[PDB]
Design a protein around this ligand. Structure first.
Ligand code: SFG
Ligand code: ZN
Ligand code: ZN
Ligand code: ZN
Length: 227
């Protein structure tokens, strides 16, 4: 299968030409952060010393109060630049490639070994209210779309990556997945990202459990249909 790197999506003209010859997926509008279709209405970690930073100690690691609350730190974190709990904000994504699968369309694969319980990518898109979601559901069905790109975020917010999003929109479903979603608060706004739940070796497809298309995940426990 052909593959491509995330940076290949930054050049719209080369992409559209790659897409014409099947070497990249269909064009979509690449975004860095969620766009609201309709606009809506500090931890206790001790600052690491310069010595500790040099020693390789982690700032705002597993014991960070904000991290436990699933809240990212701000620029005002006691650890400032060294804070490791600003992953969404700093786009500290995993090394992933977009690949053409045998029967699912395009997907995502690990380009390096990915440790367990690490951030992969944020699921970005157009954030829809209930009314917008209703309309998009109807439109996509009218247009006979094969692939769907919806992800519930919170009450009255559903992310739609069909038209605008990032490479997260390519992560396929598996009944025995190696990633999960987590909803994180950044500056009082909720976002959602993919995180590994296992060590994913280099070359392996990244998958999550979506929640009537037959399922081609290939798992021994396959539930047979996407759900
Ligand atoms: N396990 C699977 N078995 C079959 N089709 C799948 C599976 N996982 C994802 N898909 C397909 O991919 C869509 C979900 C997309 N967000 C994933 C990217 C999509 N594969 C693409 O080529 O753009 C679904 O609506 C299905 O059409
Ligand atoms: Zn902290
Ligand atoms: Zn912090
Ligand atoms: Zn399955």
């Amino acid at each position: 299968g052909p593959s491509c790197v995330m940076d290949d999506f930054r050049d719209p003209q080369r992409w559209k030409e790659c897409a014409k010859q099947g070497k990249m997926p269909c064009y979509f509008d690449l975004i860095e952060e969620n766009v609201y279709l309709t606009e809506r209405k500090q931890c206790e970690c001790t600052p690491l010393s310069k010595d500790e930073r040099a020693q390789g100690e982690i700032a705002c690691g597993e014991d960070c109060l904000n991290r436990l609350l699933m809240i990212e730190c701000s620029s005002r974190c006691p650890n400032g630049d060294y804070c490791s709990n600003r992953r969404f904000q700093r786009k500290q994504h995993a090394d992933v490639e977009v690949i053409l699968t045998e029967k699912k369309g395009w997907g995502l694969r690990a380009a390096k070994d990915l440790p367990s319980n690490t951030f992969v990518l944020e699921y970005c898109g157009e954030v829809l209210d209930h009314k917008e979601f209703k309309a998009r559901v109807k439109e996509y069905a009218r247009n006979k779309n094969i692939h769907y790109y919806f992800m519930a975020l919170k009450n009255d917010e559903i992310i739609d990556a069909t038209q605008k999003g990032n490479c997260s929109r390519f992560m396929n479903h598996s009944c025995e997945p190696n990633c999960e979603t987590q909803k994180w608060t950044v500056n009082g706004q909720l976002r959602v990202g993919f995180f590994t739940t296992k060590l994913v070796p280099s070359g392996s497809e990244l998958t999550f459990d979506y929640q009537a298309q037959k399922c081609f995940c290939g798992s021994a426990n396959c539930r047979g249909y996407l759900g």
